[model samples]
Target chain A: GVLYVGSKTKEGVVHGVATVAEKTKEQVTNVGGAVVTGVTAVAQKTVEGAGSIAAATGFVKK
Target chain B: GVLYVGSKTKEGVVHGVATVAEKTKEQVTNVGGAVVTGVTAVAQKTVEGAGSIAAATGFVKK
Candidate 1:
């Protein structure tokens, strides 16, 4: 999610934020629970969308 | 934090995402990150944002 001020990623321009999102999420996996599911699919799409935008931003380093 | 995966919901559209977010937070409540609370605070919010948007999309598919 890579938000500014660490609040919700409010507003537009939702970009390569997925890394931070995934990074945070990765830290919580395999926790003790009854085995929940149904996030990977959407999260992956989110991650990819964020990643693509994130990658695309590199060209902005002028 | 139910992500597009298990990264990281609600009523009106946030129902399912919250379940995952809490689940993820539960894991890190006992982790070793005392020296980095800022990142932690911001990070969790980021996860929440990602999760909400995530669930919103899924719910829309309904």
Candidate 2:
């Protein structure tokens, strides 16, 4: 299903962002931490986090 | 171009998120600020932010 693919892919963005810090090494800045902190906060907002993003991207209909 | 459409759409997600705060109002929390701040940091990381996301979502190929 297109919707399923889109949702999974968007969720991947949600989780994938976490690993960016590792790839960049210890950047010693808020950015290193902010992505995780920020996204975590967003996820906590609801299942809204990635799903909202997916909807906004037209990966899923609202 | 499919790549261009996908990039634009994903970037829409990036900008669209900023407006979410307006829709939700003063929620009395970091989520209000975090989305903007976090995405801004990610964008500053390079054009890599949304494009990386688009590519990750298969909207664009790496």
Candidate 3:
């Protein structure tokens, strides 16, 4: 497990999507996981104030 | 800003989605942000092992 430290924030918006993913993993198709990972990277980079978002997600060289 | 400490894991899977979101904000919507927040919460809870994914996303009581 990893520690994802951040502002513990959100509302039912996630609940609706998460419920759907839980019900049908195939339909969701890891999209949820990808989005989470991307956002985490963006947030992490934003917090760091270094590295472009592209580099944060490893598209271009940092 | 807050500190989001995590495993910092992911691959191009996130890059694809993130690029799309970056290009068109509305087309992607806050879904990206929401997903990130949810995953962060789930990861945090998972690390703690003190709450269900539901509680992590605020669907049920922790």
Candidate 4:
């Protein structure tokens, strides 16, 4: 499915907000056949130089 | 829904931390009517010479 998305960045770091229209069968299958769909938003901040880090926040529906 | 987050990094590369809260009804509708929610986190590394890349780490709830 096509999803509408937006993101903000601070010093090369990106935070995203998305309005999802739908999920495809393929996407569900990829996630072990889990039903997944929704309006999702995430706030991400990047460290200037780090090999490992954390993820942006998110929400999903099934 | 609610979530928690954090991050660290080195050398022009970036690492991040993320905590997710909950999913909404609209989100569920987008995924073909699936319930999804949770706290998620991802770690990512970017290469200067690489055109393609991997996604950060994350946790999913459905």
Candidate 5:
């Protein structure tokens, strides 16, 4: 299913297929960024985002 | 986890899990659309709701 796509920027880390549809690699690169390489890499990115979301929402990580 | 599901739509690049269950393939097709093929396809169909309680609360993407 081609999991994990896109890259991180100062604004945010763009991972997941949605990032690819909305933002291109060139757009990311223009902002001093690069696409995430692999599935695990993307997962790591997700984890990072999730952590932020969790902190914002007061979710306890299991 | 399965990733890269759904497709771009006129309605704001319909991406993610929630898109699948709410809209049917026929509904999507009727709107000058086509079913996305492969795992990346939009589910375009749903079972019961996640029920209502599952709706207002948060979900775990991980």
Candidate 6:
């Protein structure tokens, strides 16, 4: 598992995006990966949701 | 989107985990979220994968 950080600022937003981006990209192509990506994509696209996420992290003082 | 950070250290691992934890939790609850979680889970579980993830992010001098 890994930890991420975030703030209410652009840095936070950018950071968060970058953090998940890799995991997002990697998972889209393999085993459980494609499942996660495909599932997330379909789920989000179908429901029109990127899907809700948890509380802010990282710069939120993490 | 959010950014997460990681190192070869625990900080990185913790950061990565934190980054995805929220989106993971919320989606597991409703709509496409559940589907995402479910499909991803099944895909990973079936393949016995947490699914592959992108490279370590938010670190390596990021």
Better of 2 and 5 by TM-score: 5
Model 2 lDDT at residue A35:
31
**Interface CA RMSD, all predictions:** 19.9, 19.9, 18.1, 16.9, 18.2, 20.2
lDDT of 2 by residue, B1-62 (tens): 01111111222122222211233311221122123333212222222223322211112112
Regions more than 4 Å wrong, model 2? A1-17, A20-52, A55-62, B1-34, B38-56, B59-62
Mark the regions of model 4 whose C-alpha exceeds 4 Å error after superposition.
A1-16, A28-45, A53-62, B1-62
lDDT of 1 by residue, A1-62 (tens): 33223222222221111111222432422111111222111112232223211111111111
TM-score of 6: 0.15
Scored against the native two-chain complex, candidate 5 gets a DockQ of 0.05
Q: How close to the true structure is residue A14 of candidate 5, measured as C-alpha lDDT? A: 18
Show the lowest summed lDDT stretch of 10 residues, model 1 chain B: B53-62
Candidate 6 retains true contacts at a fraction of 0.08
Off by over 4 Å in 3: A1-34, A37-49, A54-62, B1-30, B33-35, B39-62
Model 4 over residues A1-62: C-alpha lDDT tens digits?
23233423333422322333333331211111122221222332222333332222343546
For A1-62, candidate 6 gives per-residue lDDT tens digits of: 33253222221111111223232212321112222332112222221223222221121112
Those runs of model 1 whose alpha carbons end farther than 4 Å from true positions after fitting are: A1-26, A35-62, B1-14, B19-62
TM-score for each predicted model, relative to the true structure: 0.13, 0.14, 0.17, 0.16, 0.15, 0.15
Candidate 1, residue A22: how far the Cα is off, in Å: 4.6
Please report, in order, the local distance difference test score of every candidate based on alpha carbons. 0.21, 0.22, 0.27, 0.27, 0.23, 0.22
True contacts kept of each: 0.02, 0.01, 0.06, 0.04, 0.03, 0.08
For model 4 the local lDDT of residue A11 reads 36
Can you give the lDDT of residue B29 in candidate 6? 12
Where does the lowest 10-residue lDDT sum fall in candidate 4 chain A? A28-37
Q: Write the per-residue lDDT of candidate 6 for residues B22-43, one digit (tens) a residue.
A: 2231111111112233111222
lDDT of 3 by residue, A17-54 (tens): 32112222122112222234423333222222221121
Clashing pairs in 2: none
> What tens digits encode model 5's per-residue C-alpha lDDT throughout A1-62?
24533322222221222212222221210111122222223222222222212111212224
